[PDB]
């Protein structure tokens, strides 16, 4: 199990141009994925190690190391609180180094979809000045079909910290886990034990007591799509790459623009948690010649707002655990989904949709307005009624049903969602509102029916 660890995105295109080479020249599927933890694969390795060691990339050694990629809010709206972020992503990511996830969030964007997590730091400042992160844990949406025993569980609050104690904290909740876990999953741990004694724990260990929450709400979890001013004269692009999949295909050579934009890029890039990729720090200057070349490669293409909402897990053809297509069926899905929005005059909002290929849910549905969850060829569980902010599970809606069925269902509901929400009403919101499907209000005891 060959995926790079990256905290926070962040890769530079001297790193950028060696994966492109490693990809075209010495793989079977040539491309480089960009996966929802912010970082890349390659997919049928033909050396690997030595090429990463070679810009200075490691790989998590998954044989024993069950932690995985450091996420951190990439594009936020507060510029100035990106590099702190960063730098602490970054530093739990190497105290971290010998499963596991935890995030860095910056209010009000939940792109890196917290709630899916183990562990979460949620940026708090006074003055353009982070200070210290409210904390997180128990996030984790791997279910088994038909298990009531399994549950996707959402995060719950533990408190506040200074920074000062952000690594002894990041220490005691995965040394508790790994040590009270039986079924081992944090989540499952927290509601055997209950949160206040896993809590209590986390404090003993890390020789703190959790302050209370600080305010934060967030807003959305969708990526920033284009162009967006930075701080100082740097401006961040933001691509839109379909599923993450980078290769050059027929009037769209994504991979070659990629790399000459690389060739010329005087900043790093920012792989996103939505499987995109940001081309951050250009200065003003440098805009119409990036910009020229992503227009010309096919990676400024516009798509709607609902394909910019909607993910895929990889499945087939390299997943070895896939029950139904994800990534190869989610183009053509969202195809006929935009048909829907169009025919009922909603072309330009969205609903968060998503496709994962079996119920461990790497495709994040049970975050989803809309889920689906593989369960055999051509066969997916619809649930229904997240929120568009992820912190809501969709209950089950139709079980095991084929793709003309989930387009029949919600040519129904979207139909009616056109019709009859309020203003501003999210269409999972609305079909909790509308009573087509009861909302989930604590998973372990009532996710399932
Ligand atoms: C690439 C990615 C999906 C994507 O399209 O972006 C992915 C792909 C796979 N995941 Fe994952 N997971 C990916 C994010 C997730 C997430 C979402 C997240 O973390 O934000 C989850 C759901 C959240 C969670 O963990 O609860 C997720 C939960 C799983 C699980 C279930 C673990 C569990 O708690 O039960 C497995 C199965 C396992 O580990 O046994 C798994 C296993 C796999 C494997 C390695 C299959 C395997 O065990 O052999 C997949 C490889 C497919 C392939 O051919 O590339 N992956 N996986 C993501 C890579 C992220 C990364 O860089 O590390
Ligand atoms: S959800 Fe299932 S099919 Fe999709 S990548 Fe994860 S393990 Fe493979
Ligand atoms: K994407």
Avoid at 35 to 42: A, I, K, P, S, V
Avoid at 50 to 67: E, I, Y
Avoid at 428 to 441: N, Q, S
């Amino acid at each position: 199990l060959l995926r790079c660890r990256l905290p926070g995105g962040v890769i530079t295109t001297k790193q950028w141009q060696a994966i492109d080479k490693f990809a075209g020249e010495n793989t079977i599927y040539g491309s480089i994925r960009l996966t929802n933890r912010q970082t890349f694969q390659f997919h049928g390795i033909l050396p690997v190690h030595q090429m990463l060691h070679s810009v200075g990339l490691d790989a998590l050694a998954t044989a024993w190391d069950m932690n995985r990629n450091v996420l951190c809010t990439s594009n936020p709206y507060e510029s100035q609180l990106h590099a702190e972020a960063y730098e602490w992503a970054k530093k739990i990511s190497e105290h971290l180094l010998p499963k596991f996830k935890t995030t860095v969030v910056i209010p009000p964007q939940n792109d890196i979809d917290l709630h899916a997590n183990d562990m979460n730091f949620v940026a708090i400042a006074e003055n353009g000045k982070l200070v210290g992160f409210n904390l997180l844990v128990g996030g984790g949406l791997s279910i088994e079909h038909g298990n009531k025993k399994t549950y996707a569980r959402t995060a719950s609050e533990f408190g506040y910290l200074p920074l000062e104690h952000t690594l002894a904290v990041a220490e005691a909740v995965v040394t508790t886990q790994r040590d009270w876990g039986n079924n081992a999953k944090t989540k499952y741990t927290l509601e055997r034990v209950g949160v206040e004694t896993f809590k209590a724990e986390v404090e003993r260990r890390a020789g703190i007591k959790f302050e209370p929450i600080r305010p934060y709400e967030f807003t959305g979890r969708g990526d920033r799509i284009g162009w967006v001013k930075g701080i100082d004269d740097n401006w961040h692009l933001t691509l839109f790459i379909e599923n993450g999949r980078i290769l050059d295909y027929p009037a769209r050579p994504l991979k070659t623009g990629l790399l000459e934009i690389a060739k010329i890029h005087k900043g790093d890039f920012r792989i996103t948690a939505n499987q995109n990729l940001i081309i951050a720090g250009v200065p003003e200057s440098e805009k119409a010649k990036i910009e020229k070349i992503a227009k010309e490669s096919g990676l400024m293409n516009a798509v709607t707002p609902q394909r910019e909402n909607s993910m895929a897990c990889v499945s087939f053809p390299t997943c070895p655990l896939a029950m139904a297509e994800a990534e190869r069926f989610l183009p053509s899905f969202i195809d006929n989904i935009d048909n829907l929005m169009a025919k009922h005059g909603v072309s330009d909002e969205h609903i968060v949709m998503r496709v994962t290929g079996c119920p461990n849910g790497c495709g994040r549905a049970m975050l989803a307005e809309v889920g689906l969850v593989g369960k055999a060829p051509g066969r997916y569980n619809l649930h229904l009624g997240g929120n568009r902010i992820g912190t809501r599970i969709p209950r089950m809606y139709k079980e095991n049903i084929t793709e003309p069925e989930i387009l029949a269902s919600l040519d129904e509901l979207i139909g009616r969602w056109a019709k009859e929400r309020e203003a501003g009403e999210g269409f999972g919101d609305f079909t909790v509102r509308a009573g087509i499907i009861r909302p989930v209000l604590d998973p372990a005891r009532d996710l399932w029916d």
